[PDB]
């Protein structure tokens, strides 16, 4: 009975792990792309149209 409960809990934690890992990888990828591009270009990507 204890093993059955632990199975569900353990799996939710695995899902949380997957999530945080995906977010980590996405932010790293963002950083890698920003370093290869001039900040002015990236600024245009993110914000161009919103600046007066």
């Amino acid at each position: 009975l204890k093993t059955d409960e632990e199975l569900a809990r353990s799996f939710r934690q695995i899902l949380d792990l997957s999530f945080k890992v995906n977010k980590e990888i996405s932010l790293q990828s963002q950083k890698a792309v920003e370093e290869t591009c001039e900040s002015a270009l990236v600024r245009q990507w993110y914000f161009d149209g919103s600046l007066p």
Partner: protein, 257 residues
């Protein structure tokens, strides 16, 4: 009668014809009310009102207990199959197909999916980057081969080389432009495909605002009723004192005269 006045105040549709019906309904109530006061003794009428008030409090308590249980009722509970069809009793409102009420997803769960999709794009980027590097190396090898065949030192060969490089640059740039346009088309199609969904969300958003405003109206009315019922209670007390004062000041002194 009061409920009808309440519904009309919430539905802004001031239908201009509903006043004559209101009056008739008031008069009908007055007549009936008077009949009641003439047919039954005041002590009996007051007792009846006390009893009716007990019932309202009982119903409120029952609702709270059931409603509070609903707040404390979250889904592990298994669909027990209990049997017997009496009549129908589909729902208090009348029907209840809806309960798909699967636990609406939480922000966390949705946002998790969003980041998973973002990773799919990053993974695709890496794939295409590797492909572009292979192609760039392959193109450099081919250009070098063509340049070696035009190296016969003649002014015409040099010019032919320059013309080649220029034609090649034009083809590459045309290819880049066509590709970017193509990608822009895709992005537009995707956005166009979702435009309907966005309209729908806008409508929902309007609905939420309207219904937020609807809730505000119901609350503003609840405030008015609460204030109105407190004032009526004071008025009844005043009317009771006025009737007693009339009997003491004007009727009781006559037997002596």
């Amino acid at each position: 009668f009061l409920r009808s006045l309440h519904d009309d105040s919430i539905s802004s549709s001031v239908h201009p014809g509903k006043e004559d019906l209101r009056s008739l309904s008031h008069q009908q109530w007055m007549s009936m009310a008077e009949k009641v006061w003439n047919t039954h003794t005041p002590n009996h009428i007051l007792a009846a009102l006390e009893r009716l008030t007990l019932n309202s409090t009982q119903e409120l308590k029952k609702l709270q207990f059931s409603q509070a249980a609903d707040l404390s009722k979250g889904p592990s509970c298994q669909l027990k199959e209990f049997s017997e069809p009496i009549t129908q009793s589909r729902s208090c409102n009348e029907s209840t197909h809806l309960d798909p009420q699967e636990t609406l997803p939480s922000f966390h769960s949705l946002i998790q999916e969003g980041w998973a999709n973002s990773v799919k794009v990053s993974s695709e980027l890496r794939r295409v980057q590797s492909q572009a590097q292979a192609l760039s190396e392959h193109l450099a090898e081919r250009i070098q081969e063509i340049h070696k065949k035009l190296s016969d030192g003649s002014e015409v060969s040099v010019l032919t080389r320059a013309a080649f490089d220029a034609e090649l640059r034009c083809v590459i740039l045309r290819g880049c432009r066509d590709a970017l346009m193509q990608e822009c088309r895709m992005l537009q199609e995707e956005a166009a495909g979702k435009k309907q969904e966005m309209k729908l969300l806008q409508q929902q958003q309007q609905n939420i605002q309207e219904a937020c405003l609807l809730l505000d109206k119901k609350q503003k009315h609840i405030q008015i009723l609460i204030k109105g019922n407190s004032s009526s209670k004071s008025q009844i007390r005043r009317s009771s004192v006025e009737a007693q004062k009339y009997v003491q000041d004007k009727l009781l002194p006559w037997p002596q005269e």
